[PDB]
Amino acid sequence: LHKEPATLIKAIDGDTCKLMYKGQPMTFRLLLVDTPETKHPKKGVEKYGPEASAFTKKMVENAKKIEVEFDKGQRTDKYGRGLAYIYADGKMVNEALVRQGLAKVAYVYKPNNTHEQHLRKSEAQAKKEKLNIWS
Ligand SMILES: Cc1cn([C@H]2C[C@H](OP(=O)(O)O)[C@@H](COP(=O)(O)O)O2)c(=O)[nH]c1=O
Ligand SMILES: [Ca+2]
């Protein structure tokens, strides 16, 4: 995989944001994870959704540099959102949320699952420590 620079435009919630990539503004969705919902009324405001948003928001608002890393399969989902592993100063946001028990590993679609085991191992640790979602 290869990392590429991006510019933060607006953090939406725990796992979705707007970034300037390749000169064009677009919304991104974190690969392999799911932070709780805060928008869609069908799900309503789920437990830890606000917490995840705030964590993602802080993490990325103070970053000197942001990079996006696409997996080996499709780069956008059906909603037109870019699918990537996103790093804030070399720290993978997808993994940081799972490690805190603020996201579960989800939507594992081959072949976009390169860092699946890494995330699995951090989710297991968050579970054993009874963190947030696992509390
Ligand atoms: C992470 C991710 C989400 N999705 C889809 C599955 C879900 O579709 P449906 O909306 O049809 O259920 C939705 C979950 O994203 P949200 O957590 O943003 O809702 O996005 C993909 O298509 N591929 C992905 O890699
Ligand atoms: Ca979500």
Active-site entry in 46, 69, 81, 116:
81
Q: Is 15 annotated as a binding residue?
A: yes
From which experimental method does this structure derive? X-ray
Contacts of 78 (CB under 8 A, 6+ apart): none
The finding on whether 16 has its CB within 6 A of some atom of ligand 1 is yes
**Ligand 2 is a single-atom ion; what residues have CB below 5 A from it?**
15, 34
CB 71 within 8 A of CB 31: yes
Nearest CA to ligand 1 atom 22: 77
Residue 76 vs residues 6, 54, 81, 84, 122: alpha-carbon distances, Å: 16, 25, 5, 9, 25
Domain count, the chain: 1
The residue type at 132: N
**Resolution of the experimental model in angstroms, please?**
2.1
Rounded distance between C-alpha atoms, residue 36 and residue 50, angstroms: 8
Please say if 81 is a catalytic residue: yes
What range defines the domain where residue 7 resides? 1-135
- Residue 72 · residue 113 · CB < 8 Å: no
**Cα–Cα dist 3/86, whole Å:** 9
- DSSP at 101: T
Which residue, judged by its Cα, is nearest atom 20 of ligand 1?
77
Question: How do beta strands 66-70 and 24-30 pair?
Answer: unpaired
Distances (CA, A) of 116 to 11, 51, 108, 123: 24, 23, 8, 10
Write the DSSP symbol of residue 41. T
Question: Shortest CA distance to 14 belongs to which of 48, 40, 43, 62?
Answer: 48
CA distances from 129 to 45, 54, 59 (A): 24, 21, 21
The runs of H, that is alpha helices, within 31-75 are 49-61
User: Domain holding 4: CATH number?
Assistant: 2.40.50.90
Give dist(CA 53, CA 71) in Å, integer: 24
